[PDB]
Amino acid sequence: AGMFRALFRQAVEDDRYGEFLDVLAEASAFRPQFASPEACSERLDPVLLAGGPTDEGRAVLVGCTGTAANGGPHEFLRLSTSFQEERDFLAVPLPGYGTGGTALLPADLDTALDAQARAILRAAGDAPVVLLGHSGGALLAHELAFRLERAHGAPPAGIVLVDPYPPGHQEPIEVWSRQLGEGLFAGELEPMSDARLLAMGRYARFLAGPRPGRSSAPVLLVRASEPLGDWQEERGDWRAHWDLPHTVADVPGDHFTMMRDHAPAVAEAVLSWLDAIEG
Amino acid sequence: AGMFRALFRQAVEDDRYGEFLDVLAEASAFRPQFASPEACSERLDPVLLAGGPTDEGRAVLVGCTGTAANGGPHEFLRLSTSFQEERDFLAVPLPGYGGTALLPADLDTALDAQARAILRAAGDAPVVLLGHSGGALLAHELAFRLERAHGAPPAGIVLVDPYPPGHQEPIEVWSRQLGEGLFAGELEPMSDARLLAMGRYARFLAGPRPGRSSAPVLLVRASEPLGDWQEERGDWRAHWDLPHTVADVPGDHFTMMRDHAPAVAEAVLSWLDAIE
Ligand SMILES: [Mg+2]
C-alpha cells in the first residue's frame, strides 16, 4: 500500500534494488526529522523478550533492531526463546520506524544512536551489556557500541555481529541484490509502508558513510554457512566479514534462514562465547 | 494523498524544489513504461475547446499540455474562450498522466504518440502549436519531431514564457514559487503517479535535444517578475533565440495565463493573421 512499495517491487523485478535504495535514501531527506535525542518522537523502551536465571554482574543481551522495512518487534522472537533461563534479552527499537502520524527520522546516525543508548542504559542498570544485531542490525550494533563508549562512557562487554557485510566487503550484497530484495518481500507479515521504506533508505545511507571509530568491545562474528544465491568461486569468499573478531562461529542456513530456521544455533554460539568471555 | 506529494510539499517549504524534481525523475525509472508510440496505454485524441467560424486552409491551434502534476484538462480553458469564433483550438494530452498510465520511455516516444493523434484530428488544416512554460518547451520539441519524423512541420509555434536550457536561471531562482504555484493551483491532491510523470518529463527537457524547428515562432513574455530579482542580474524574462515576433503581456509567469489570458489570445490572433 503506497507508491514506494510498488516502485520497490518493480526495481527488484528489474534487478535494480541497489539503485532503488539510493532513491529511498534521497527521498528520505524530505521526511520530518528529529535533531536531538530528546526530540525523538518514539518511546525507545526496550522490550524484555527472555529472562535469565533468577540466581549480579552477569551480562544482558540487547538485540539491536535492523533496518529492514518489513521488521519490527517480531524480529528477535525466535532467537530470544533460546535465551530463556540463560540470559536476559532486551530488544531495542530503531528510531524512525514507529507509529502513533508516523515517526520522525533521525537527522544523523549519532542522533538515533544516542536515543537508543539512553534507553539501553536506563533499562540495563548496572548489568554489563552485550549488543547483538543481524545484517543491517549488525552494522548498527557496532556503531551503537562505539557511541556508547565514546559519548556515554559505557562500552559494552561485547558485540555479536550476525552476518555483517561491512563497507569493504560488498560484492555478495551487489551480486545477491535481487535475492536480498526478494527476501524482504518474502518476509512481509504486512505490506511495507512507504514511511518504513524511507526509514530503511535513510539508515542504509547512514551506514554507507564515513564511520571512523572502532569499538574496543570484543566481537563474536556469526556467519551463515549457505550462500544466499549463485556465486562464482573466483570472486573470492562470499561469507560475512568483520575485521579482527574475537571469535568466529559458523551456523547452518543462509543470510536469511540462519535466523529464520536456525536461530537455536545462533543462540548456542552466543551462549558458549559469553561463558568464555566472562570466566 | 500519497507519500510523494507529502515529500514534495516539504521540499517546497525547504526551498529544495529542484532537488526533489531530481528524486521524482530517478523514481520514475521504476514505473511501467511504453517504448513505442503504438504501445501508449492512453487515447490521446485532442479535445476541441473552441470553434472557429464556419466560413479554408486556416490554421488550427493545438494546445500542448505542460508537465504540471496538478494540470491536465483544465490547462487551456480560460485561454480557449478567447478563440471562440476565431480559431479551432484543440488540446492534446501529455502521455503518462492518464491503473495509471504508462510513462514514455523517452521524449521522442511521447512526441510520436502526440504527433499521430494531432495529424488525424487536424486533417488538412495547418497546425500552430501552443504551449506555456514546460509546455512551451514541449511545443517546440513536438514541432521538430513533426518536421523531422512525420514530414509535417507545423505552420507556427507559440511559446508562452519559455525558459529553455542556457536561459533558466530566473525560473531556477524562483523554483519555490513554482512549487507553491503547483500546490495553490491544485483542484485535487496531486497524485504520486503524476508527480513521477512531471519529474520524468522535466528530466527529458533538460537533456540534449536533436535540433531546431524551421517553423516561425511567436514568443509571448510575462511583463512582471515572479519573485525577487536584482537589477544587476540582467533580464529575468523568458527567452527564445530570434523569434519571428515577440509579444509582451501583463502578468507574471502564472498570471499571464491566470488573469491575462485574453492578452495572450490577442497576441496570438494578430500573429496568425500576419503569418497567413
Ligand atoms: Mg580483517
Helix (H) or strand (E) holding A194: helix A194-208
Whole-angstrom distance, CA of residue B115 vs CA of residue B146: 6
Which technique was the structure solved with, according to the deposited record? X-ray
The binding site of A for substrate consists of 67, 136, 163
Q: How many CB atoms lie within 10 A of CB A238?
A: 22
Give the C-alpha separation, B69 to B169, whole Å.
22
Residue with cell 507508491: A3
> What distance in Å separates residue A182's CA from the closest CA in chain B?
16
Task: Give A63's contacts (C-beta < 8 A, 6+ positions apart).
Answer: A49, A75, A76, A79, A80, A89, A90, A91, A92, A132, A133, A137
Nearest neighbour of A3 by CB, restricted to B4, B11, B20:
B4
Q: Tell whether B48 is within 8 A of chain A (Cβ).
A: no
A135 catalytic? Reply is: yes
R_g of chain A, CA atoms, integer Å? 18
The CATH H-level (homologous superfamily) assignment of domain B1-276 is Alpha/Beta hydrolase fold, catalytic domain (3.40.50.1820)
d(CA A269, CA A248): 9
| Cβ-defined contact of B32 to A23 (cutoff 8 Å) | no
Please tell me which residue in A28, A80, A82, A135 is annotated as part of the active site. A135
Q: How many A from CA of A241 to the centre of ligand 1?
A: 8
Asked if the C-beta of B27 comes within 8 angstroms of chain A's C-beta atoms, the answer is: yes
Active site (annotated) includes residue B253: yes
- Residues B38-74: b if buried by 16+ CB within 10 A, e if exposed: eebebebebeebbebeeeeeebbbbbbbbbbbbbbee
Considering the candidates B28, B133, B175, B213, report the single residue annotated as catalytic: B133
HEC sequence for B145-183: HHHHHCCCCCCEEEEECCCCCCCCHHHHHCHHHHHHHHH
Question: What b/e readout covers B100-118, taking b as 16+ CB neighbours within 10 angstroms?
Answer: bbbbbeebbbbbbbbbebb
Contact B31 A10 (CB under 8 A): yes
Mutate to test the interface with A, among B19, B30, B100, B194 (most CBs of A within 10 A): B30
Please, are residues B47 and B90 in contact by the beta-carbon 8 Å criterion?
yes
CA separation, residue A159 to residues A121, A128, A141, A251, B245 (Å) = 16, 12, 7, 17, 74
Q: Whose CA is closest to B87, among B215, B265, B260? A: B265
- A250 touches B: beta carbon within 8 Å: no
All three cell numbers of B100: 495509471
User: Chain centroid to CA B246: how far?
Assistant: 18
Cα A244 to ligand 1 centroid, rounded to whole Å: 5
- Compare CB distances from B2 to A3, A16, A20 and report the shortest one's residue: A3
By C-alpha distance, the chain A residue nearest B13 is A30
The SS3 of residue A16 is: coil
| Spacing of C-alpha A1 from chain mean position | 25
Q: Has B54 been labeled as part of a binding site?
A: no
DSSP A47: E
Structure-block grid coordinates of residue A37: 535525542
DSSP tag of A99:
B
- At residue A243's C-alpha, the angle toward residues A238 and A247, to 5°, is 90
The residue in chain B having the minimum alpha-carbon distance to the alpha carbon of residue A31 is B7
Task: Tell me which amino acid residue B201 is.
Answer: Y
Judge whether B255 is annotated as a binding position.
Answer: no
- Paired residues of A122 in beta bridges: none
Per DSSP, what are the bridge partners of residue A131? A62, A159
Give me ligand 1 centre to Cα A129, in Å.
25
Q: Are B21 and B199 in contact (CB under 8 A)?
A: yes
Query: Does the beta carbon of A27 lie under 8 angstroms from any beta carbon of chain B?
Result: yes
Assess if CATH 3.40.50.1820 describes domain A1-279. yes
**Structural resolution in Å:** 1.9
Q: Does B203 touch chain A if contact means CB atoms closer than 8 Å?
A: no
CA distances from B83 to A118, A195, B64 (A): 69, 47, 16
As a whole number of angstroms, the distance between CA B120 and CA B116 comes to: 6
**Residue in A3, A10, A11 closest to B192 by CB:** A3
Contact B10 A32 (CB under 8 A): yes
Domain ranges, ordered by start, for chain A: 1-279
